[PDB]
């Protein structure tokens, strides 16, 4: 994202990746909040 708004992107990939960053940082702290489809790495292992 740093390089993508370092060059003035279309201001529309920035919404759907700011939501990605919001999701990823709201994924580290608390995952058991309703909604917000859970993330997984291994064999169906939700994040701890």
Report in angstroms the alpha-carbon separations of 30 from 9, 13, 42: 31, 26, 19
Closest to other proteins by CB, 33 or 45 = 33
Residues 6+ apart with CB under 8 A from 26: 33, 36
Residue from 26, 39, 40, 47 touching other proteins (CB under 8 A): that is 26
CB of 32 to other proteins, least distance (A): 15
The Cα–Cα gap between 1 and 33 comes to 26
Residue from 8, 29, 30, 42 touching other proteins (CB under 8 A): that is 8
Residue ranges in contact with other proteins by CB under 8 A = 5-8, 10-12, 19, 22-23, 26, 35-36
């Amino acid at each position: 994202l740093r390089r993508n708004e370092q060059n003035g992107a279309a201001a529309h990939v920035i919404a759907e990746d700011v939501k990605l960053l919001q999701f990823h940082v709201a994924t580290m702290v608390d995952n058991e909040l309703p909604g917000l489809p859970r993330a997984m790495q291994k064999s169906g292992r939700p994040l701890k």
